[PDB]
Design a protein around this ligand. Sequence first.
Ligand SMILES: CC(C)(C)S(=O)(=O)C[C@@H](Cc1ccccc1)C(=O)N[C@@H](Cc1cnc[nH]1)C(=O)N[C@@H](CC1CCCCC1)[C@@H](O)[C@@H](O)C1CC1
Length: 334
Amino acid sequence: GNTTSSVILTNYMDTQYYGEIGIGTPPQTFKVVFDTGSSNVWVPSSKCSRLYTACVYHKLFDASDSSSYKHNGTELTLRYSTGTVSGFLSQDIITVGGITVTQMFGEVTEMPALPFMLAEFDGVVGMGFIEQAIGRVTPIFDNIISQGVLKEDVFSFYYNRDSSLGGQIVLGGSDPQHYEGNFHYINLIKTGVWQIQMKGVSVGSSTLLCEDGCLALVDTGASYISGSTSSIEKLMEALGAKKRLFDYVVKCNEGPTLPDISFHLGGKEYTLTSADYVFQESYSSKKLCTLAIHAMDIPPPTGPTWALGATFIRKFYTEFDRRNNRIGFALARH
Ligand SMILES: CC(C)(C)S(=O)(=O)C[C@@H](Cc1ccccc1)C(=O)N[C@@H](Cc1cnc[nH]1)C(=O)N[C@@H](CC1CCCCC1)[C@@H](O)[C@@H](O)C1CC1
C-alpha cells in the first residue's frame, strides 16, 4: 500500500465539522465528527427510543438491514466534555473514503437533547488511542494501520472558514493544496493521547500565561480553544471580554481592536488575530460579539490542559503522525 484516501467535510457555522462514512452491507451512511480527543466510534441505533429528540432528527443504524452485521451487545457510556451517550457494541463493515474496515462501534440508545439536538452530524469517530477507548475497543485508525494500505501512518486535518470545501481529512498523508510552508513538529508528551507541551500563551507581545509551561490537547472534535477556568478568567480580563453565562463576549465595535493571542508550541509561535477568534456578527456598539474561546475543566489524568480546537486548526493545517508520535502544524491555504 501507498494509498491515501480523503474525506470531504462540511463546515456548519464554524463550530461543526462533519463528514460521511457508511456502515453495514449494503452501506448505511452517517455524518460524523472526526475527534482526536476521544477514541470510540458510535452512531444512533434503530433501537434509540423516539422519545429522544436527538434520535428523531438523526439517522439510525439498522442491524436488521445489514448482512455484514456481527453481534456483540456490550453496554457502554461515553462521556465527553460536552455531552454523553450510552448504547451497546456492534461489529460491522465500515467505510471511510476508499478504505473499508471491520470495526467495533457503539449503537447509541440514549442521546440527550443537549447538546445533540443541535448537532448537524449524527455520529463521531474517535481518532485517538486505545488508551482512551471505553471497553478497550480497537479504534478505527489502529484498525486501518493493521491493513497496511496507508502510504504513511498519518492522517491530516484541513478546516476551512465558513463558505467551496468546508474541510478535509486525509488518511495516509497530507494535502499540500491546503497548506503552505513546511510542517513544524512537536513530539507527544506521552503516547496514548494527542497532547503536547505548551511553553506560553501571550496576549499581545507579552506572555500572560503558561509561564512555567502547560499541556495542550490538539482536539479536532472541539469547536473552540479551551483552557481551565482560571486561565480563561485571566485571559478574558486581558481582552476586557465580559463573561456571559457560558460564553465570553465583547461589544462588536471593539472586536477588531482586540490584540493577538499567540501559542508557543515547540520552536515557534502560533498566532491568532481578532479575525480568527471573534465571531464578527456585527460591528455595532449596541451588539455583543462572541469569542471562539471558553473554559473547559478537563479532569486528570488528561487535565488540567488546554484544548486547541477548530479556532486554531482553521489557522494551522494539522497532521497527526502515529509512526513517530508527533503532531505537525502548517499555515492553512484558504
Ligand atoms: C456550542 C459550543 C460552545 C461551541 S460547544 O463547545 O458546546 C461545542 C461542542 C461540540 C458540539 C457542537 C455541536 C453539537 C454537538 C457537539 C464541543 O466543542 N465540545 C467539546 C468541548 C471541549 C472543549 N475543549 C475540550 N472539550 C467536546 O466535548 N469535544 C469532545 C468531542 C465531541 C465530539 C462531537 C460531539 C460531542 C463530543 C471531546 O473531544 C472532548 O470531550 C475530550 C477531549 C477532551
